[PDB]
């Protein structure tokens, strides 16, 4: 019943590439059907990326519109995992008014090579019993105090220096609270008030949720895993106490010297064994839109030893390159085109279009009759697959309107008559030649 932020989109059924241990694609597995050769090549490049030893490798996926190129991209993104950085950028997400195209491409590249750091700290989680503060009268500003912690098994009393006292006062910690103390940095994280200590209370000075008491020993160890991209390290080191630029995106055209310094420091960090560098994948979709200067910057930037495994995508033919007047395959100059492997996709058939419709209905929880499936497949062959996929939800809604439970051919015909296709819309469009604008 509850609706989370993630809804059912166009590629919400693909949970992977559906490959066996022998890297042989199956006819129908993990939401992907058909397109055997492209799935094979994608599995090869996925294993290659997983190994992660060679850098600056590019792969282009080309084919007809609506033949699964973006589907393959999402499939390999899901199969790669959550802990391996993956960046999806459209073709126009680099033409910015705040930084140059080359700068945007550099940021996109550096955003894909992640650094994993395991941070283990010693912490003290416990319930507050009482706090002792001994303010000086005059003196020189030196403060002294004590702090008693208690758990269900053990308890202790700690002394306080001149540094954590100000933090405790800033966080306004009192009796009856459960706190976690970070021994290394010195921060105080607030969990909540206890139960028994709440019996003796003044008027409401703190009204919030409730928590229990940390059982076991008072002192424990905590571990966090941080995955930090190179670009945000660059942004951090580009200015003092600059961290909102990670979210604000205000840093523009960072100085290169910072970039080589970060590269060197990451090299030493890898050597010392503290942090681990993991290359990621960049996916530029609809890359025909990139200006020629962007392509030529890609040429040189792909020869570095820290470049990611960028994946291209294009559905154009012999078209002139944007910003120029020269024709070329895929709208890409031969220079970049000569530095990567090209994977092509084949048009779909009836047998696998039917299975695509079936898995889409399974994802959307829609039931149709076999005759309805046949009619939908005929529509999705006379007309593109996207239209047939879209008609499923409308047919299900129309069926539910009449208090039905199984979608029928009449509902599908009704929806087909109600909405329109591009071809039929253009056909009806020719008879209003003078009624439209700028024909």
């Amino acid at each position: 019943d509850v609706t989370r932020i993630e809804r059912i989109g166009a590629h919400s059924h693909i949970r992977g590439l559906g490959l066996d241990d022998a890297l042989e694609p199956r006819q129908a597995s993990q939401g992907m059907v058909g397109q055997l050769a492209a799935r094979r090549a994608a599995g090869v490049v996925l294993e290659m990326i997983r190994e992660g030893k060679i850098a600056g490798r590019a792969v282009l996926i080309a084919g007809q519109p609506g033949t699964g190129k973006t589907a393959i991209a999402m499939g390999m993104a899901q199969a790669l995992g959550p802990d391996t950085p993956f960046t999806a950028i459209a073709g126009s997400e680099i033409f910015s008014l705040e930084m140059s195209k080359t700068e945007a491409l550099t940021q996109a590249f550096r955003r894909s090579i992640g650094v994993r750091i395991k941070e283990e700290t010693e912490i003290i989680e416990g319930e507050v019993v009482e706090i002792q503060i001994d303010r000086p009268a005059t003196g020189t500003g030196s403060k002294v105090g004590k702090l008693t912690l208690k758990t269900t098994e053990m308890e202790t009393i700690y002394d306080l220096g001149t540094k954590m006292i100000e933090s405790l006062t800033k966080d306004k910690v009192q009796a009856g609270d459960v706190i976690t103390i970070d021994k290394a940095t010195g921060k105080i994280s607030k969990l909540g008030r206890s139960f028994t200590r709440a019996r003796d209370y003044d008027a409401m000075g703190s009204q919030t949720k409730f928590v229990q008491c940390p059982d076991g020993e008072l002192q424990k160890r905590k571990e966090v895993v941080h995955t930090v991209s190179l670009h945000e390290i660059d942004v951090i080191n580009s200015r003092t106490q600059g961290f909102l630029a990670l979210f604000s995106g205000d840093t523009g055209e960072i100085k290169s010297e910072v970039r080589e310094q970060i590269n060197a420091k990451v090299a030493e960090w890898r050597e010392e064994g503290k942090a681990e560098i993991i290359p990621g994948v960049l996916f530029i979709d609809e890359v025909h839109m990139l200006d020629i200067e962007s392509f030529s910057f890609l040429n040189r930037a792909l020869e570095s030893d820290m470049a990611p495994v960028l994946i291209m995508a294009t559905n154009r033919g012999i078209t002139r390159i944007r910003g120029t007047s020269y024709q070329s395959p895929h709208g890409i100059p031969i220079d970049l085109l000569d530095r990567l492997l090209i994977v092509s996709t084949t048009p779909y058939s009836e047998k696998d279009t039917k299975q695509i419709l079936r898995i889409r209905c399974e994802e959307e929880d829609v039931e149709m009759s076999e005759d309805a499936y046949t009619v939908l497949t005929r529509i999705g062959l006379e007309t593109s697959l996207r239209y047939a996929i879209q008609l499923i939800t409308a047919a299900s809604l129309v069926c539910r309107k009449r208090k039905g439970t199984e979608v029928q051919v009449d509902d599908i015909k009704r929806v087909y008559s109600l909405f329109l296709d591009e071809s039929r819309s253009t056909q009806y469009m020719k008879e209003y030649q003078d009624a439209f604008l700028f024909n």
């Binding site: 509850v2 989109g9 166009a10 205000d250 979709d285 909405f419 591009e422």
Partner: protein, 443 residues
């Protein structure tokens, strides 16, 4: 009285229980298939299941495509966001187009979260630091708590407070005669000012007086607030604090839109997912309506490509009125509706047809009645004929000037003479174009 707009009468699609379109209901006449399709779209939006599905209303100018979007908005209600847009809003001198589009996409998704407010407020009367009578070793006394008396228009009551609050009381100017308020959850103290009761003890006081509070001393209520997902983005991008040179410096400088990074969204999504899983906040997807889409750019369309298949994008309704036009941003790549074919395969097209003279006359009558205008049949038929000669907009527009002319002549309704005089005065597009063509040598 609220002034009459150009789409005031549209109150809904006017559908049955079975979804069939009535001939004339809720201010809409005709376009039965379009109204049924819009009702299906309304059901889809209320389903709270799909994401990124798009519909394109295609038809000639002045056929009601803009009106049907507002009808969908009205039938949706007011608890679901509905963000309008034109095609010219993307072109900004402060930020890139794909960020204008991304911000708008994030605008059409709203939250709704509930919380409780607890406060002790009122006039202060006395401050009694009640002591425990038996100081401890090495000390002359042991203050136990502070007794604070607060009185409002209802009554007076005494509250026992932690001694440390006194340290805050001297931080501000907490004297008898002031009105204060303390937040139960926070625990701080703030002074509003002296009461109005003591506003006459002097002739010139530098402080302004506030009225005595009415109601109980301790107030506690429950409030539900709705924030769009774009508001969280701007709130987290620009932290509004005063205890910094950065916060204050940025708050002094000219505020500028900043291209929000995708990492910020990745954490906002996580936190809202956590709070939804805890049952505190309720997510409600909305609708984003782009009219005059033909003004977009090929880069904007190519970004919309990827934007639609997202699992978070809301439902988008496009509208356009162009024929076989050149796509903006290209040289001679013509396309229907000025929209690229590859994008146009991701949308569901809803066709809108012309209007028959009977429906045009019905529309004219509905506009006249909603506007508060009385018209005679012999003049209403003439106005409908004139509109059918040229267009519907030119017929509806002449309603007000005819009424003004009749009121000047003293009559309470429009007759044939008023309509013919108004038509003689003003001109339409066709006759003006004919005149321009005739007099081309003197322009």
């Amino acid at each position: 009285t609220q002034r009459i707009a150009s789409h005031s009468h549209v109150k809904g699609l006017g559908l049955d229980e079975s979804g069939l379109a009535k001939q004339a209901a809720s201010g809409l006449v005709g376009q039965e298939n379009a109204r049924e399709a819009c009702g299906v779209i309304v059901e889809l939006i209320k389903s709270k299941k799909m994401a990124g599905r798009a519909v394109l209303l295609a038809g000639p100018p002045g056929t009601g495509k803009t009106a049907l979007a507002l009808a969908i908005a009205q039938e949706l209600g007011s608890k679901v966001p509905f963000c309008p847009m034109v095609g010219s809003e993307v072109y900004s001198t402060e930020i890139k187009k794909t960020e204008v589009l991304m911000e708008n996409f994030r605008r059409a998704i709203g939250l709704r979260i509930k919380e409780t407010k607890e406060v002790y407020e009122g006039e202060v009367t006395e401050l009694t630091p009640c002591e425990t009578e038996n100081p401890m070793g090495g000390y002359g006394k042991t203050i136990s708590h502070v007794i604070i008396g607060l009185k409002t228009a209802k009554g007076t009551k005494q509250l026992k407070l932690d001694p440390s609050i006194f340290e805050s009381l001297q931080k501000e100017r907490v004297e008898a005669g002031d009105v204060i308020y303390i937040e139960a959850n926070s625990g701080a103290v703030k002074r509003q000012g002296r009461c109005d009761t003591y506003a006459t003890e002097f002739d010139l006081e530098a402080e302004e007086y506030v009225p005595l509070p009415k109601g109980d001393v301790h107030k506690k209520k429950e409030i539900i607030q709705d924030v769009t997902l774009h508001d969280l983005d701007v709130a987290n991008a620009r932290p509004q604090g005063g205890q910094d040179i950065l916060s204050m410096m940025g708050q002094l400088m000219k505020p500028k839109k900043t291209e929000i990074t995708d990492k910020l969204r990745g954490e906002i999504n996580k936190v809202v997912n956590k709070y939804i899983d805890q049952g505190i906040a309720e997510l409600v997807p909305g609708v984003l309506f782009v009219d005059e889409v033909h003004m977009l750019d090929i880069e904007c369309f190519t970004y919309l490509h990827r934007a639609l298949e997202s699992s978070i994008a809301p439902i988008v309704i496009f509208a356009s009125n162009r024929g076989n036009c050149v796509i903006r941003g290209t040289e001679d790549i013509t396309s229907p509706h000025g929209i690229p074919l590859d994008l146009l395969d991701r949308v569901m097209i809803i066709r809108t047809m012309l209007y028959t003279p009977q429906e045009m006359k019905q529309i004219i009558k509905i506009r006249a009645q909603t506007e508060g205008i009385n018209i005679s049949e012999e003049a209403l038929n003439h106005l409908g004929e004139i509109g059918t000669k040229t267009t519907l907009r030119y017929s509806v527009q002449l309603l007000t000037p005819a009424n003004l002319l009749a009121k000047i002549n003293g009559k309470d309704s429009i007759e044939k003479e008023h309509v013919e005089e108004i038509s003689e005065l003003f001109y339409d597009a066709k006759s003006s174009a004919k005149i321009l063509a005739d007099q081309q040598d003197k322009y």
